[PDB]
RNA sequence: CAUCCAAGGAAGGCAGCAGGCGCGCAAAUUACCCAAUCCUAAUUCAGGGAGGUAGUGACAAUAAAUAACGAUACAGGUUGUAUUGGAAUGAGUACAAUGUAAAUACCUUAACGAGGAACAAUUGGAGGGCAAGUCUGGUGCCAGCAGCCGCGGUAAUUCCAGCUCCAAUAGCGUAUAUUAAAGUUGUUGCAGUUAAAAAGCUCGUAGUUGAACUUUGGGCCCGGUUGG
RNA sequence: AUCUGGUUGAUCCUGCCAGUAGUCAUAUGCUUGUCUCAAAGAUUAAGCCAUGCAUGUCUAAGUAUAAGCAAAUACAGU
């Protein structure tokens, strides 16, 4: 059902955009796996 | 008393003389196959695909023996390979009869598995052969291919296929990393050397008995049956019983070595004591779904006496703490009890019996023997030519003819999702013998009182214990469970596998029923309950049995209220209309008897 | 037997495994320059470690010691040739101030992006590995190739590829044929 | 120790190459060739399991694929999230030539060879040490987890399963030994009142160690190197 | 040229246990697409060995009547 994740070089490209663009700050202490 | 320091010399000397002992043992073990006077190794060929024809395998092997004089409308062969001074006996089973395949493999030293490079192994037959053979035990195994050229374009295309087959074979026999290609002389020679030079593994349950493969069979008149062959197991004694797989137990009057050993008759003897399918399947499918959600629940109804329906039952506080008596006098108990054998410590009895048996052995491995069996002459019509069909004879241990309460482990076969009702008859094979059994299922637990819950159906997932009355086995043989089904291409439905655990009569099984009712009015210290009962006389009669909610709270009856069988009760805490109130009643279950099967 | 073949390991692993500040700084480099591994960063810091060790040793020698003059000048000459060290900083004390970004800047993968030709460092890497870029006459398909200052004028598309002047590729040709077959009804 | 036999007799030494048994946690083909390197002989020519070639081979080492780019819709200060379109390429297969003693493979190349690009990356973790979950279902101090501190007896941040997330990545985990951490072996460089550790006391041989003093100062030429 | 967790009601110490990084150091588990290069029955048993092979050699120039081959009456090629 869900698509596969890319591998190698293309995966580091993905991580880079999470942590330095689409950040969630939650009282200034950014969090990586926020409980919904 | 003084402490001692090891000098270089005595260090050296001790290591040397320990090596000598090790070396003497290896010779001692290989002696059984030592040469042209020694025993033959028993090879069974099993093609996993109908394509193959087993005689093509045997042909390619003998080409490497470098003796055309070795190399026909028969299925058992004796061969001497002078190149290795080796004696072989080759057995080919008739691949039509699934049960006959298992029997030939049971006596083998090496099983040779044939694989096809052209055609895929079938899930419904080829796989089931491999899976089943593993679970009864295998002495050793070799993987072989014989038709690999049939896919040739270049040899590199052959190797792609061979790597696929090696991966497949290693899934079942992970100790093996190579599959031999018999179309290459070097590989085919490599296989032949292994069969001659290498010792097999033992089979524990087999080698603690005696067994022989018949060389000749003959009858003498009121009947007497003569067999001769080579002893392989722990050995035979003329005072012990003798099993033959299709015909049951028999007694022997003489042993002789090709000294004579008559039956001395201070011995034991042959005695055991001292469209409906659519409706039925749908019924179990519906019932098992219900019991999976609402186990053991029973409905009383209006205009029914709760007493006479249920007066048989006891009612108890907790299974793991009750003082239920073992040999209770209750009339449902089976007609045999003192007649049944009772053992106590199975472990200490088992190993003690074996230790004596090897000491009392009259004929031993490698002996040439003739055997005279007291055989009812009317069965003679069922004997087949031993050059076409495998005929084999097994020893019994002293008390293995006597019935007792026995327990088995059970878990489901690879993908058998069908419901299994507890009372339904099943066929069980353990060791060589097989019996029709009606089991009872329970979860394994460590109850200090040996009381355990009876269950209606086999759990979908966990291992569980099955109980019945059957003859004892002192070798803890593995067990395979199946039901006959002549519509299937192999006439058999495989259900599960496990092991013979012990003989133990102190195992108590409690059948359980649940009554249930609705709380509907609530007060700070009392609750009143509907629909569990319908007359005040019933409500009073059961008053002493404890109550529980399925939310796990506990309570007790106070008294009857009114005429319609309402009652009021007290509980640990705040119930509410979403809760249900229940009470359970217990009844002793006893094992059913069992019968031989064919 | 024949004499042994010599070989050596070319990278070194950091000694504290889960230091949060280091982990962030490394991921910024990988995203900026289009690397695939942390190993590609460990390789560069391993090289720089050896360079500092050599220079740090020579600086204990007396000035005009003949060894300091000979080996010191060679080391500087070599780093200027690839453009890691500026021709203004042509002194042994400035060698100690080099840092990892100065080496990453000279990889073929990043040069092919600064020149045009490619529109991202991720697009650049694919072109190199797919044999489209030549350096002078030679096709080069390794992204970590270090571009010497003389070579920069000569980076261009390879003669034997599309973009460089050859016939269209396999997929372009297939499409034209199938269309012509349908049009050549 | 051990082989053959006509029972009179005869023959033996793989810690050379390949191969077998045994042992054990623990280790490859009974293949091709003198073309190269060299050696021996009465010799340019013969011979060479010395040596070379290929097979098995995640011991260790180097380089490095598993996707790139537009349009459209929506959101936002040129960057994100999802409907759609052409391009590019080797893994693999193969005519040929090259390679080679003859071959296999590498390098080169006509034809063929991507849309869940199914031509689908794993191995360990998510209380602390130590990067990363008040998520959701189950269970009953039990099954289990746990290097250490500990968790679990319905209300589990630690068990089991599902989502999501983290780390290294064609590699990752475990056991045993050893190096650093260790100024917990201390020459550099430890400690001995009360925490482990100054011997009841004095004499004394080997060993280690042992106060101060003897030509100091002052003139005159030559004089090389570096710096201004 | 770097350390962190554990003795207490709480604190400062002595001290060890656990954690951390490497190994041209071995074994083993799971997984495995491409190019170059490459160790390999040492550890325990300097234990025992079926079969085949591993040492021979000639130039114009020591000895020729092969009843060998091939075509200058003592001989004369190979």
Phi, psi angle pair for B48, to nearest 5°: -90, 0
Q: Give kind and range of the element (H or E) at residue B508.
A: strand B508-522
Residues B182, B193: Cα–Cα separation, whole Å: 13
Chain C neighbors (3+ CB pairs < 8 Å):
A
Q: Measured in angstroms, what separates residue C60's CA from nucleotide D208's C1'? A: 39
Bases in strand E with any atom closer than 7 Å to a protein CB: 2, 20-24, 30, 37-39, 44-45
Task: Please check whether residue B386 is in contact with residue B73, taking contact to mean a CB–CB distance below 8 angstroms.
Answer: no
Distance from first CA to last CA of chain C, Å, rounded?
70
DSSP state of C3: P
Q: Among all chains, which residue has been given the structure tokens 């059970």?
A: B410
Residues B498, B426: Cα–Cα separation, whole Å: 14
Nearest CA in chain C to A16: C31
Residues B407, B172: Cα–Cα separation, whole Å: 28
Chains A and C form CB pairs within 8 A to the count of: 25
Interchain pair C31, A8: CB under 8 A: no
Share in percent of chain A as helix, strand, coil (round to 5) = 35, 0, 65
**What is the number of residues in chain A?**
36
Task: Please check whether residue B33 is in contact with residue B41, taking contact to mean a CB–CB distance below 8 angstroms.
Answer: yes
Phi, psi angle pair for A16, to nearest 5°: -60, -40
Interchain pair C36, A8: CB under 8 A: yes
DSSP E strand stretches across B116-207: 141-145, 180-181
Q: Give kind and range of the element (H or E) at residue B42.
A: strand B41-47
Residues B251, B238: Cα–Cα separation, whole Å: 9
Chain A neighbors (3+ CB pairs < 8 Å):
C
Nearest nucleotide from residue C4 CA, by C1' atom: E38
| C7 CB and strand E closer than 7 A | yes
Interchain pair A13, C125: CB under 8 A: no
Q: Tell me the residue range of the domain where A9 lies.
A: 1-36
26-55 of chain C touching strand D, CB 7 A cut-off: 26-27, 36-40, 42-43
Task: Please check whether residue B581 is in contact with residue B540, taking contact to mean a CB–CB distance below 8 angstroms.
Answer: no
Q: State how far residue A34 is from chain C, nearest Cα, in angstroms.
A: 18
Q: Among all chains, which residue has been given the structure tokens 């193959």?
A: B52
- Select from B284, B515, B312 the least CA-distant residue to B417: B284
Q: State how far residue A20 is from chain C, nearest Cα, in angstroms.
A: 9
- Please report how the helices A9-20 and C20-33 are oriented relative to each other, as an axis angle in degrees rounded to 10: 120
C-beta atoms surrounding C67 within 10 Å:
10
- Calculate the CA B565 to chain-centre distance: 52
Q: Chain A residues with CB inside 8 Å of C28's CB?
A: 16, 20
Q: Measured in angstroms, what separates residue B60's CA from nucleotide D5's C1'? A: 36
Q: Write the CB contacts of C98 (distance below 8 Å, at least 6 apart in sequence).
A: C48, C51, C79, C84, C85
Q: Chain C residues with CB inside 8 Å of A23's CB?
A: none
With helix as H, strand as E and coil as C, how does C127-177 read?
A: HHHCCCEEECCEECCCCCCECCHHHHHHEEECCCCCCCCCCCCHHHHHHHH
The DSSP annotation for B206-256 comes to: HHTS-EEEEEEEEEE---EEEEEEE--SS-B-TTS-EEETTTEEEEEEEEE
Nearest nucleotide from residue C163 CA, by C1' atom: D88
Q: Write the CB contacts of B381 (distance below 8 Å, at least 6 apart in sequence).
A: none
Q: Give kind and range of the element (H or E) at residue B12.
A: helix B8-30
CA C59, C63, C67, C73 dihedral sign is positive
Residues B92, B61: Cα–Cα separation, whole Å: 14
**By a Cβ cutoff of 8 Å, what residues of chain A touch chain C?**
8-10, 12-13, 15-16, 19-20
Residues B226, B111: Cα–Cα separation, whole Å: 29
Phi, psi angle pair for B60, to nearest 5°: -65, -30
Q: How many domains does chain A have?
A: 1
CB of C125 less than 8 A from some CB of A: yes
Task: Please check whether residue B594 is in contact with residue B468, taking contact to mean a CB–CB distance below 8 angstroms.
Answer: yes
CA C40, C42, C45, C47 dihedral sign is negative
| B36 CB and strand D closer than 7 A | no
Q: Write the CB contacts of B461 (distance below 8 Å, at least 6 apart in sequence).
A: none
DSSP E strand stretches across B306-447: 368-374, 392-395, 403-412, 426-430, 433-437, 440-442
Q: How many CA atoms lie within 13 A of B197 on its CB side?
A: 8
Residues B567, B530: Cα–Cα separation, whole Å: 7
CB of C27 less than 8 A from some CB of A: yes
Task: Please check whether residue B475 is in contact with residue B204, taking contact to mean a CB–CB distance below 8 angstroms.
Answer: yes
The CA–CA distances, whole Å, from C41 to B437, C48, C101, C104, C107 equal: 69, 11, 10, 9, 13
Interchain pair C30, A16: CB under 8 A: yes
Q: Measured in angstroms, what separates residue B478's CA from nucleotide D141's C1'? A: 34
Task: Please check whether residue B582 is in contact with residue B516, taking contact to mean a CB–CB distance below 8 angstroms.
Answer: yes
- Please report how the helices B126-136 and B98-106 are oriented relative to each other, as an axis angle in degrees rounded to 10: 40
Distance from first CA to last CA of chain B, Å, rounded?
68
Interchain pair A13, C31: CB under 8 A: yes
Task: Please check whether residue B405 is in contact with residue B467, taking contact to mean a CB–CB distance below 8 angstroms.
Answer: yes
Q: Write the CB contacts of B53 (distance below 8 Å, at least 6 apart in sequence).
A: B47
Three-class DSSP category at B181: strand
Interchain pair C27, A13: CB under 8 A: no
Joined together, the tokens standing for residue B473 give: 């086995």
Share in percent of chain B as helix, strand, coil (round to 5) = 25, 30, 45
Joined together, the tokens standing for residue C53 give: 């060790």
Nearest nucleotide from residue B445 CA, by C1' atom: D142
Beta-bridge mates of residue B409? B465
Residues B163, B120: Cα–Cα separation, whole Å: 14
DSSP state of B48: S
Nearest CA in chain A to C27: A16
């Amino acid at each position: 059902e869900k698509p596969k994740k890319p591998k190698g070089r293309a995966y580091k490209r993905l991580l880079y955009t999470r942590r330095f663009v689409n950040v969630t700050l939650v009282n200034g202490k950014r969090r990586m796996n926020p409980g919904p | 008393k003084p402490d001692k320091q090891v000098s270089k010399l005595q260090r050296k000397n001790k290591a040397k003389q320990l090596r000598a002992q090790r070396i003497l043992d290896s010779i001692e073990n290989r002696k059984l196959f030592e040469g042209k006077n020694g025993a033959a190794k028993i090879i069974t060929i099993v093609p996993l695909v109908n394509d193959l024809d087993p005689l093509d395998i045997l042909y390619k092997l003998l080409k490497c023996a470098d003796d055309e004089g070795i190399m026909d409308s028969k299925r058992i062969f004796n061969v001497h390979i002078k190149k290795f001074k080796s004696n072989l006996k080759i057995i080919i089973p008739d691949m039509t009869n699934f049960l006959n395949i298992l029997d030939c493999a049971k006596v083998a030293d090496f099983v040779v598995f044939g694989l096809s490079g052209v055609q895929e192994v079938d899930e419904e037959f080829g796989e089931q052969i491999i899976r089943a053979l593993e679970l009864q035990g295998i002495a050793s195994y070799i993987g072989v291919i014989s038709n690999l050229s049939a896919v040739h374009e270049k040899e590199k295309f052959q190797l792609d296929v061979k790597q696929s087959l090696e991966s497949y074979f290693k899934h079942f026999f992970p100790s093996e990393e190579r599959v031999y290609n018999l179309e290459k002389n070097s590989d085919a020679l490599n296989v032949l050397r292994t069969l001659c030079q290498r010792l097999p593994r033992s089979i524990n349950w087999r080698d603690n008995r005696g067994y022989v493969v018949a060389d000749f069979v003959d009858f003498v008149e009121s009947g007497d049956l003569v067999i001769e062959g080579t002893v392989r197991g722990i050995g035979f004694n003329a005072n012990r019983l003798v099993h033959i797989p299709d015909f049951g137990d028999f007694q022997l009057n003489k042993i002789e070595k090709i000294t004579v050993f008559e039956s001395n008759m201070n011995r034991d003897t042959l005695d055991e004591y001292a469209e409906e399918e659519e409706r039925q399947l749908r019924e179990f499918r519906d019932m098992e779904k219900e019991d999976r959600e609402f186990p053991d629940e029973i409905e009383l109804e209006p205009s029914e006496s709760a007493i006479e329906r249920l007066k048989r039952y006891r009612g108890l506080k907790n299974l793991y703490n009750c003082d239920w008596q073992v040999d209770e006098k209750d009339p449902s108990s089976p007609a045999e009890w003192k007649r049944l054998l009772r053992i106590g410590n199975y472990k200490n009895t088992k190993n003690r019996i074996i230790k004596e048996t090897k000491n009392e052995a009259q004929a031993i491995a490698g002996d040439r023997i003739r055997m005279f069996i007291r055989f009812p002459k009317f069965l003679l019509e069922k004997i087949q030519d031993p050059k076409q069909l495998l005929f084999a004879v097994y020893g019994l241990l002293l008390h293995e003819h006597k019935n007792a309460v026995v327990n088995f482990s059970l878990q489901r076969w690879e993908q058998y999702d069908k419901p299994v009702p507890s009372q339904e008859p099943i066929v069980v094979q353990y060791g060589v013998r097989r019996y029709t059994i009606q089991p009872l299922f329970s979860q394994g637990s460590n109850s200090p009182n040996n009381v355990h819950k009876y269950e209606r159906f086999l759990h979908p997932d966990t291992v569980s214990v099955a109980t019945c009355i059957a003859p004892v086995d002192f070798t803890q043989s593995p067990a395979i469970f199946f039901k006959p089904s002549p519509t299937d291409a192999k006439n058999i439905e495989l259900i599960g596998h496990g092991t013979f655990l012990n003989a133990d009569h102190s195992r108590i099984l409690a059948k359980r029923a649940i009554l249930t009712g609705h709380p509907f009015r609530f007060h700070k210290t009392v609750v009143t309950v509907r629909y569990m009962f319908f007359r005040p006389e019933d409500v009073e009669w059961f008053k002493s049995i404890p109550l529980f909610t399925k939310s796990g709270r506990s309570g007790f009856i106070k008294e009857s209220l009114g005429t319609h069988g309402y009652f009021k009760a007290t509980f640990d805490g705040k119930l509410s209309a979403q809760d249900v109130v229940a009470m359970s009643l217990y009844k002793r279950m006893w094992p059913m008897p069992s019968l031989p099967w064919n | 037997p024949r004499a042994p073949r010599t070989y050596s390991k070319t990278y070194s692993t950091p000694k504290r495994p889960y230091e949060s500040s280091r982990l962030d700084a490394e991921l910024k480099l990988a995203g900026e320059f289009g690397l695939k591994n942390k190993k590609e960063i460990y390789r560069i810091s391993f090289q720089l470690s050896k360079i500092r060790r050599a220079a740090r040793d020579l600086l204990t020698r007396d000035e005009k010691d003949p060894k300091r003059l000979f080996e010191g000048n060679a080391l500087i000459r070599r780093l200027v040739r690839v453009g890691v060290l500026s021709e203004d900083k042509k002194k042994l004390d400035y060698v100690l101030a080099l840092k990892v970004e100065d080496f990453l800047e000279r990889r073929l993968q990043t040069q092919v992006y600064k020149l045009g030709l490619a529109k991202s460092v991720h697009h650049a890497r694919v072109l190199i590995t797919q044999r489209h870029i030549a350096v002078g006459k030679q096709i080069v398909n390794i992204p970590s190739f270090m571009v010497r200052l003389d070579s920069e004028k000569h980076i261009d598309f390879a003669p034997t590829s599309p973009f460089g002047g050859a016939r269209p590729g396999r997929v372009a040709r297939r499409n034209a044929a199938r269309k012509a077959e349908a049009s050549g009804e």
